């Protein structure tokens, strides 16, 4: 389970996913972000398996 923190101006929240590798998760998250109109900067922290977009 990897988590995505979405930090936007009109939309804020968090979500999670179960994926075999970080690369696979990123693709899932990117698709989601694109679909919900959230575009920004992505960061990944391996100790907490968290991706953040701003």
Coordinates of C-alpha atoms in Angstrom, one line a residue, residues 28-54:
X28 CA -1.9 4.6 -11.0
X29 CA -1.6 7.9 -9.1
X30 CA -0.7 9.9 -12.2
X31 CA -3.8 8.6 -14.0
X32 CA -5.9 9.6 -10.9
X33 CA -4.4 13.0 -10.6
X34 CA -5.0 13.7 -14.3
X35 CA -8.6 12.6 -14.0
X36 CA -9.3 14.9 -11.0
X37 CA -7.6 17.9 -12.6
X38 CA -4.7 18.0 -10.2
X39 CA -1.3 18.9 -11.7
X40 CA 1.8 19.7 -9.7
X41 CA 5.1 18.5 -8.2
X42 CA 5.6 14.8 -7.2
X43 CA 7.8 13.7 -4.3
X44 CA 8.4 10.2 -2.9
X45 CA 9.6 9.2 0.6
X46 CA 10.7 5.5 0.7
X47 CA 10.6 5.2 4.5
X48 CA 6.9 6.0 4.6
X49 CA 6.0 5.0 1.0
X50 CA 4.3 8.3 0.5
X51 CA 4.1 10.3 -2.8
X52 CA 3.2 14.0 -2.6
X53 CA 1.9 16.3 -5.3
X54 CA 1.8 20.1 -5.1

